[PDB]
Ligand binder design. Structure first.
Ligand SMILES: *[C@@H]1O[C@H](CO)[C@@H](O[C@@H]2O[C@H](CO)[C@@H](O)[C@H](O)[C@H]2NC(C)=O)[C@H](O)[C@H]1NC(C)=O
Ligand SMILES: *[C@@H]1O[C@H](CO)[C@@H](O[C@@H]2O[C@H](CO)[C@@H](O)[C@H](O)[C@H]2NC(C)=O)[C@H](O)[C@H]1NC(C)=O
Ligand SMILES: *[C@@H]1O[C@H](CO)[C@@H](O[C@@H]2O[C@H](CO)[C@@H](O)[C@H](O)[C@H]2NC(C)=O)[C@H](O)[C@H]1NC(C)=O
Ligand SMILES: *[C@@H]1O[C@H](CO)[C@@H](O[C@@H]2O[C@H](CO)[C@@H](O)[C@H](O)[C@H]2NC(C)=O)[C@H](O)[C@H]1NC(C)=O
Lengths: 49, 197, 166, 269
């Protein structure tokens, strides 16, 4: 039926007809951001002598 | 011709291509090309002329690009059709108006005649060709050493079923007796490689 | 990767990204080799399989059986037979090479044949008729045929003409 | 090509409609024509003829052009020299040639076997075995020279032919430019494709060449106009490309018809 729709009018005859485009869809989406800025000494702002 | 319509497939394809192009042009009138609609009347009735002008410019650019694409397609297709037509004229001149000795240019086999027949936007040649049907093996020889003089066949083949020797034609079997007029003399019967007696 | 959106098989990269090289790029402004923001590590990309879907069919009147050829896709991903053009689903692969009807590609062709089914095989280039050559044997034709063939040639096309404004 | 799986582009492209279905039809025609070209050139013989192991062709060494069985691909040494001489993810795909290189090799093998054992009658009807010396004598008759010249100088002509084959080997092995034309063809194709790839980097008047960047920056109402500019640019590039390749395929078809005319006239006669 896909092929019949590709020809857009008639009933298919002998041969091969390019119909559609399969694509291996992405399994998921990987999101990876940084802590933005390297490091700050909170451990000393809190645990100060 | 009566049963298999696909015998004329090429011509049909030509027609189909043309029709296809035209139909696609028709369908291009339905695309928006970025405007609000495909009907300039609808654009002008909806939008004010100052902005309807920009929308109509988008639509005009789209339709003009479609026309350019189409005329280019048909220029290329007409170039191909002209190539095929020059080929057909070369045929009509060579095979029809003569006998083309170009091997397999006018049908598989030795070409005898041709008969052109009109057809919608095309021609159909009835290439009448000779085709040798039945084959027989024979023992052959390049020349024949009669009296130390190598004898070569003037036009044809030295053939031998297995008992006598004869001269024949290279496309039919008329084994004739090897007189001194079916053959010409050249040299001795040593330089020849494979000469018989 | 830090806002960088992109799809594909994420393998690892041996590509030496000098410290200032986080993500790579291609000829079509598409990243090819990337890196980690959190725990810096390099990676490679190969966009995973897209491909064409082409339907092989005898005439609908003859049968309604179909052979779906996935081109540019190994059906490891998605009566399954792996070709070099792609892979077929719905066609048994016969080894007997016949003259082929539906050219599949990469030398392989299909046809409707018996239990009628769609079968795929390699093209038989013709009956392997070995001509019995000999240094002193010739073959002379004794009888002939006068065969008439048809040669179809397109000569003209529809002399169309368009009006631009209309 | 126009967009890497962006739905907004998909819809704004539906606004244009058949503008790419056209292109696909054209390219499919081109591919079919390529197949037809190959068949026109090589598939002129009906049956695959096979050379007998007895190489008693009167000194005419044909080993260098008859297929060598040892090679995995059954190809003649000359064809190996030729093969050594000649050397994306955006919808751009290369469909495989229907006829493999090995099937074309077997076709040329059958043609050589026919023109060697039967000479030319294999093209008109069925192959008719004939001693190669007599076949060259008939060719000489066709030139205007009589059979005696050949039969009396068979050894000398054989030596000249073998030396000429050796010279051809040397010229093919040394000068790569001998196959320049074919290389040019390949190069042209590659060039076109590469340029298409590079067209994905042009702005065409928009802010960027990445529709994702446009959509992330601009609101959809204005991102639509920018994507329309980008789509127009990329579609125009595609049209230019398919036109270039239509013209180039027309030229290739002309050369292929010339090659088929040769294969029919010189080879088969
Ligand atoms: C080769 O052909 C010749 C000629 O047709 C054959 O010789 C004939 O043999 C028949 C039967 O004995 C005789 O009636 C004819 O008078 C012979 N003709 C000649 C020219 O002498 C010969 O027998 C054939 N040889 C073979 C092996 O087929
Ligand atoms: C044709 O006749 C010649 C001469 O009789 C044959 O050549 C002779 O062959 C024999 C056997 O090899 C030799 O002993 C003679 O010395 C050869 N003579 C000469 C002059 O070369 C030749 O073989 C015969 N060919 C055929 C097909 O019968
Ligand atoms: C015809 O060609 C064959 C194949 O190239 C030649 O045989 C080769 O001869 C060389 C030199 O002796 C050897 O190194 C190769 O191994 C041989 N190859 C094979 C397959 O036997 C042959 O000498 C040539 N004949 C002439 C007269 O040119
Ligand atoms: C005609 O030319 C050929 C060469 O094309 C001559 O054959 C050469 O003869 C010389 C001297 O004997 C040899 O050294 C060469 O090796 C031969 N070449 C070949 C390809 O065999 C031939 O002798 C010439 N004939 C005449 C009468 O001049």
């Amino acid at each position: 039926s896909e092929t019949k729709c590709t020809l857009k009018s008639f009933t298919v005859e002998k041969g091969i007809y390019q119909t559609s485009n399969f694509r291996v869809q992405p399994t998921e989406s990987i999101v990876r951001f940084p802590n933005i800025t390297n490091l700050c000494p909170f451990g000393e702002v809190f645990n100060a002598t | 011709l009566s049963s298999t319509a696909s015998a004329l497939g090429k011509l049909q394809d030509v027609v189909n291509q043309n029709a296809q192009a035209l139909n696609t042009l028709v369908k291009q009138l339905s695309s928006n090309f970025g405007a609000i609609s495909s009907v300039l009347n609808d654009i002008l009735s909806r939008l004010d002329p100052p902005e309807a002008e920009v929308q109509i410019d988008r639509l005009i650019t789209g339709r003009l690009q479609s026309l350019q694409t189409y005329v280019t397609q048909q220029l290329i297709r007409a170039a191909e059709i002209r190539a095929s037509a020059n080929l057909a004229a070369t045929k009509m001149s060579e095979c029809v108006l003569g006998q083309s000795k170009r091997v397999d240019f006018c049908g598989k086999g030795y070409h005898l005649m041709s008969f052109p027949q009109s057809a919608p936007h095309g021609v159909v040649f009835l290439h009448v060709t000779y085709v040798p049907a039945q084959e027989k093996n024979f023992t052959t020889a390049p020349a024949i050493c009669h009296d130390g003089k190598a004898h070569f066949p003037r036009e044809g083949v030295f053939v031998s079923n297995g008992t006598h020797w004869f001269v024949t034609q290279r496309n039919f079997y008329e084994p004739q007796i090897i007189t001194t007029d079916n053959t010409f003399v050249s040299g001795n019967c040593d330089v020849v490689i494979g000469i018989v007696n | 990767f830090n806002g960088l959106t992109g799809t594909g098989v994420l393998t690892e990269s041996n590509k030496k990204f000098l410290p200032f090289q986080q993500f790579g790029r291609d000829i079509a402004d598409t990243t090819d080799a990337v890196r980690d923001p959190q725990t810096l590590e390099i990676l490679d990309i190969t966009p995973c399989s897209f491909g064409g879907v082409s339907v092989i069919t005898p005439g609908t009147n003859t049968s309604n059986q179909v052979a779906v050829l996935y081109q540019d896709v190994n059906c490891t991903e998605v009566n399954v037979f792996q070709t070099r053009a792609g892979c077929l689903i719905g066609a048994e692969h016969v080894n007997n090479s016949y003259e082929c009807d539906i050219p599949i590609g990469a030398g392989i062709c299909a046809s409707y044949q018996t239990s009628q089914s769609i079968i795929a095989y390699t093209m038989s280039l013709g009956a392997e008729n070995s001509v019995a050559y000999s240094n002193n044997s010739i073959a002379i034709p004794t009888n002939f045929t006068i065969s008439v063939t048809t040669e179809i040639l397109p000569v003209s096309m529809t002399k169309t003409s368009v009006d631009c404004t209309m | 090509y126009i967009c890497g799986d962006s739905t907004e582009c998909s819809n704004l492209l539906l606004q244009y409609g058949s503008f790419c279905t056209q292109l696909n039809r054209a390219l499919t025609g081109i591919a079919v024509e390529q197949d037809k070209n190959t068949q026109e050139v090589f598939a002129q013989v009906k049956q695959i003829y096979k050379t007998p192991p007895i190489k008693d062709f009167g000194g005419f060494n044909f080993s260098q052009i008859l297929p060598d069985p040892s090679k995995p691909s059954k190809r003649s040494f000359i064809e190996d020299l030729l093969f050594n001489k000649v050397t994306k993810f955006n919808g751009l795909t290369v469909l495989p040639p229907l006829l493999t290189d090995e099937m074309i090799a077997q076709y040329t093998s059958a043609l050589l076997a026919g023109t060697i054992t039967s000479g030319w009658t294999f093209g008109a009807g069925a192959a008719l075995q004939i001693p190669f010396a007599m076949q060259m004598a008939y060719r000489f008759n066709g030139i205007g020279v009589t059979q005696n010249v050949l039969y009396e100088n068979q050894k000398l002509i054989a030596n000249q032919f073998n030396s000429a084959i050796g010279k051809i080997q040397d010229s093919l092995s040394s000068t790569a430019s001998a196959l320049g034309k074919l290389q040019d063809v390949v190069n042209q194709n590659a060039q076109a494709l590469n340029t298409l790839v590079k067209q994905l980097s042009s702005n065409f008047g928009a802010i960027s060449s990445v529709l994702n960047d446009i959509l992330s920056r601009l609101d959809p109402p204005e991102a639509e106009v920018q994507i329309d500019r980008l789509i127009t640019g990329r579609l125009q590039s595609l049209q230019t490309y398919v036109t270039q390749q239509l013209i180039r395929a027309a030229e290739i078809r002309a050369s292929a018809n010339l090659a088929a005319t040769k294969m029919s006239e010189c080879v088969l006669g």
